[PDB]
């Protein structure tokens, strides 16, 4: 209706475009000052549509609304998901899915949860259509995958960890470690959820943002 008012959506420093749209927000009348209604909502941005790069088109990021000055919303990192079509596409029978996951905390003291998928690779002398690994092996692979991911996550500040996700480092590392025990193929992080973000500092958030 007539009382709404546009507001611009900015994204933090690491992403290229940093203007991922405009959002309308209802009436400015007391006692509900519009800013409160604006704060805390959440945005699903396609990752390709944020860099302009279609090799990331099967990923989308969640960015949350956390601080406002007048006409501007600057947002924070909130999660990372794969598009459901891409996830389905990887799955084809005669190969066997391996899914790990774990809970881990950052140097900044965010608690996050990571859901990591991994598929088997056929390799050239095999012939035979099925490629399934021994269950003892998949269990070892899963443990190893959990181990690498928790170690890699734990290390750094959050901004760098998110930056690591963007050109997909974690999967490469997982594949290299597992190669000795079993060959793998397209290894992604299916989902990332933030579990417990630490208490807000506008200062730090903006300083990260600029």
């Amino acid at each position: 209706f007539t009382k709404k008012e546009w507001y611009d959506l900015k994204a933090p420093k690491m992403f290229l475009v940093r203007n991922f749209g405009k959002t309308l927000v209802t009436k400015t009348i007391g006692k509900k000052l519009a800013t409160d209604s604006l704060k805390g909502r959440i945005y699903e941005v396609n990752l390709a549509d944020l860099n302009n790069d279609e090799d990331q088109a099967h990923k989308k990021i969640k960015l949350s609304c956390d601080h406002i000055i007048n006409r501007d919303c600057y947002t924070d990192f909130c999660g990372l998901s794969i598009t459901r079509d891409k996830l389905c596409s990887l799955i084809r029978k005669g190969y066997t899915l391996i899914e790990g996951h774990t809970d881990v905390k950052t140097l900044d003291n965010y608690h996050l949860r990571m859901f990591c998928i991994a598929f088997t690779k056929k390799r050239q002398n095999q012939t035979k259509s099925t490629c399934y690994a021994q269950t003892s092996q998949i269990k070892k692979i899963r443990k190893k995958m959990v181990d690498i991911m928790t170690a890699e996550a734990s290390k750094v500040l959050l901004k760098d960890l998110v930056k690591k996700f963007i050109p997909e480092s974690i999967g490469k590392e997982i594949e290299k470690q597992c190669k000795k025990i079993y060959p793998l193929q397209n290894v992604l992080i299916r989902k990332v959820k933030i579990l417990k973000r630490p208490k807000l500092d506008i200062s730090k958030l903006m300083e990260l943002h600029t």
Binding site: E54, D85, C88, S89
Partner: protein
């Protein structure tokens, strides 16, 4: 009688299996017996896809595919012509 050597189902070395439920009528059917079709389907037709490409940003846009997998019971499968009746000699034919 004893028409089907394996009873139209893949049970061997197994006492019991899960039922899954028929998508086109909801009846219970054992997974080893059920008629499974991994239907790869596109969100729209071709002429629709053409119009969407024309409208779309990017210009390298590509329509998303639908990944379903539908399980049918024997009655449903024969009724909607997923599986034909065939003839007595040819009942062991497949691919």
């Amino acid at each position: 009688p004893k028409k089907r050597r394996n009873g139209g189902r893949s049970k061997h070395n197994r006492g019991h299996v899960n039922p899954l439920r028929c998508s086109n009528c909801g009846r219970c059917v054992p997974k080893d017996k059920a008629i499974k079709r991994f239907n790869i389907r596109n969100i729209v037709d071709t002429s629709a896809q053409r119009d969407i490409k024309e409208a779309s940003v990017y210009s390298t846009f590509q329509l998303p595919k639908l990944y379903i997998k539908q399980c049918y019971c024997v009655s449903c499968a024969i009724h909607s012509r997923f599986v034909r009746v065939r003839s007595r000699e040819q009942r062991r034919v497949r691919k």
